[PDB]
């Protein structure tokens, strides 16, 4: 019988992606529970073709395994009586917009299926370490003041993260406890500033309103040039301190 937490997540992903039964995974060699430094055992990578009505562009969808209790035997996560969460109670997801270069390949260019970028696996491992080392889990609406380009590029204006509920995956119960899917969203400095000083959910709601800022499913585009407040200056009206 398979590891019960891992199996629940795989089963959930099978329902959501019935036509991708065997995705690529980034797999760790020395597992964290054997003394490795990378807390995620696996990161699945899926292609999502998009959805016109919901303003979802084609993108790569990443899902981590290891922040929740994959195994049930305390090899990583101690089980406390009366705790309902599986491990830290969540896994990380990330939605990454295909670049213009990538988009010109898969429709005309020929032989073999295009490989997803693997750099987001480092990003999720690093966020995973941050959560293990501080002991704080992530909640919807949270921000992470990462302060560096998510892809390690010198050019991307996306240096920080907000946390949203994954629109496809949502939250599930498993044999080892509940697992929320916490979708990481790359944001501009001003977006981070306002999520921090005002509110994260309200900033995510702004981002969802247009395709240019992520559409309904909050896809991160590393080449995004303008923040939501630059594109739609009306959103600034919600940010004023009220006196009183």
């Amino acid at each position: 019988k398979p590891p019960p937490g891992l199996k629940a997540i795989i089963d959930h992903l099978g329902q959501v992606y019935p036509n991708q039964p065997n995705p690529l995974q980034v797999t760790t060699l020395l597992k964290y529970w054997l003394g490795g430094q990378d807390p995620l055992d696996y990161i699945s990578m899926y292609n999502y073709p998009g959805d016109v009505d919901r303003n979802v562009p084609p993108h790569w969808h990443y899902i981590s395994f290891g922040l929740s209790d994959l195994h049930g035997d305390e090899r990583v996560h101690l089980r406390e009586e009366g705790v309902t969460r599986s491990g830290m109670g969540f896994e990380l997801t990330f939605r990454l917009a295909k670049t213009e270069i990538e988009l010109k390949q898969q429709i005309e260019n020929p032989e073999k299926p295009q490989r997803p970028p693997t750099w987001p696996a480092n990003l999720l491992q690093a966020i995973g370490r941050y959560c293990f080392q501080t002991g704080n889990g992530l909640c919807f609406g949270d921000n992470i003041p990462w302060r560096k380009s998510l892809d390690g590029s010198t050019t991307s204006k996306l240096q920080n993260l907000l946390v949203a509920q994954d629109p496809q995956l949502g939250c599930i119960d498993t044999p080892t406890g509940t697992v929320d899917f916490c979708q990481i969203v790359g944001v501009f400095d001003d977006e981070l500033e306002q999520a921090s000083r005002w509110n994260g959910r309200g900033v995510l709601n702004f981002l969802r309103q247009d395709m240019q800022t992520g559409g309904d499913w909050l896809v991160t585009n590393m080449d995004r040039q303008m923040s939501v407040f630059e594109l739609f200056p009306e959103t600034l009206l919600n940010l004023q301190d009220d006196l009183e």
């Binding site: 795989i10 995974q25 797999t27 990378d38 699945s44 696996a121 491992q125």
Partner: peptide, 28 residues
Amino acid sequence: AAPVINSHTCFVSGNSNMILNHMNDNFA
């Protein structure tokens, strides 16, 4: 003379503790 076919070797995006495989390589 100094040539090098020698070629070792970090596996996924700079992380030597990671490899790229298919899900079914990891499970039934």
